[PDB]
C-alpha cells in the first residue's frame, strides 16, 4: 500500500516505514505529523483517486530531526570585465518516518 502526499510545495509517494527528507518544518523533534490531504491511496487493486483529495484518508509520520544538506559553491565571473563574486549555501531539511497509512 502506498499514498501520495504534499509537503513543502512538492509531492511524494510513500509506503509504511519509509524515511524521507522534506523542507524544514516547525515541528519539534519526536512529534507526530498528520497529513489529512492525501491525493491518492492504492491497495493493490483497491484504487482511490481524490478529486482534489481523498475523503477520509490519513497518513501519520514521526519527526526524526532537522539538518542541513551538503555545501554548494556559487561562482559568478564576467570575463574581461574585472568582476567576480562567490558565496556558499547549505539548505535546511526535516527528516520524517512514515508510521501509518489509512485509506
Amino acid at each position: 500500500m502506498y499514498a501520495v502526499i504534499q509537503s513543502g510545495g512538492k509531492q511524494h509517494r510513500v509506503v509504511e516505514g519509509e524515511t524521507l527528507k522534506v523542507e524544514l518544518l516547525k515541528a519539534e523533534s519526536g512529534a507526530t505529523i498528520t497529513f489529512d490531504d492525501v491525493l491518492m491511496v492504492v491497495n493493490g487493486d483497491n484504487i482511490q483517486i481524490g478529486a482534489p483529495v481523498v475523503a477520509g484518508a490519513k497518513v501519520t509520520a514521526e519527526v526524526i530531526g532537522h539538518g542541513r544538506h551538503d555545501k554548494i559553491r556559487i561562482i559568478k565571473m564576467r570575463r574581461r570585465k574585472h568582476y567576480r563574486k562567490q558565496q556558499g549555501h547549505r539548505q535546511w531539511f526535516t527528516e520524517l518516518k512514515i508510521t501509518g497509512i489509512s485509506g
Binding site: 484504487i47 483517486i49 481524490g50 559553491r73 561562482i75 559568478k76 565571473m77
Partner: protein, 117 residues
C-alpha cells in the same frame, strides 16, 4: 616589520590544487592552468543547477506520453482531462506510477477520458 609571503601563499595555492583533483594533465598539476579550470567548473555548475529541472521535466513528460499512448490517449489530451477532472497530481508522481504500476495509470487514464467525455 618585514613580512614574508611563503606560508599563506603556499596554503592558497594548495587549496586550489586540492579542488582541482581528478583533472587531466596540467589542469591538476600547474597552478595557472588549475585556477582557470576551477572557476569554469563553478560557472558550469551554476548554469546546470537550472538546466537539471528542465531535463527531468522533459523525461517525466516522455514517460507519461508513453503510458497515455498505451492506454489510448495522447499526453495533451490526458493532461487536459485530468485538469477538467480536478486531479492535481504532478508529472513526477505520474511518471513514477507510469513506470512502476500499469493498473493505477490505467485507472488515471480512465478518469481523464471520462472527464473528457
Amino acid at each position: 616589520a618585514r613580512v614574508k609571503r611563503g606560508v599563506v601563499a603556499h596554503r592558497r595555492h594548495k587549496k586550489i590544487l586540492a579542488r582541482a583533483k581528478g583533472y587531466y594533465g596540467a589542469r591538476s598539476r600547474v597552478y595557472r592552468v588549475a585556477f582557470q579550470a576551477v572557476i569554469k567548473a563553478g560557472q558550469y555548475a551554476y548554469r546546470d543547477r537550472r538546466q537539471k529541472k528542465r531535463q527531468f521535466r522533459a523525461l517525466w513528460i516522455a514517460r507519461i506520453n508513453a503510458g497515455a499512448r498505451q492506454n489510448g490517449l495522447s499526453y495533451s489530451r490526458m493532461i487536459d482531462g485530468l485538469k477538467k477532472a480536478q486531479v492535481i497530481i504532478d508529472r513526477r508522481v505520474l511518471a513514477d506510477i507510469a513506470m512502476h504500476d500499469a493498473v493505477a495509470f490505467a485507472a488515471l487514464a480512465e478518469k481523464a477520458k471520462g472527464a473528457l467525455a
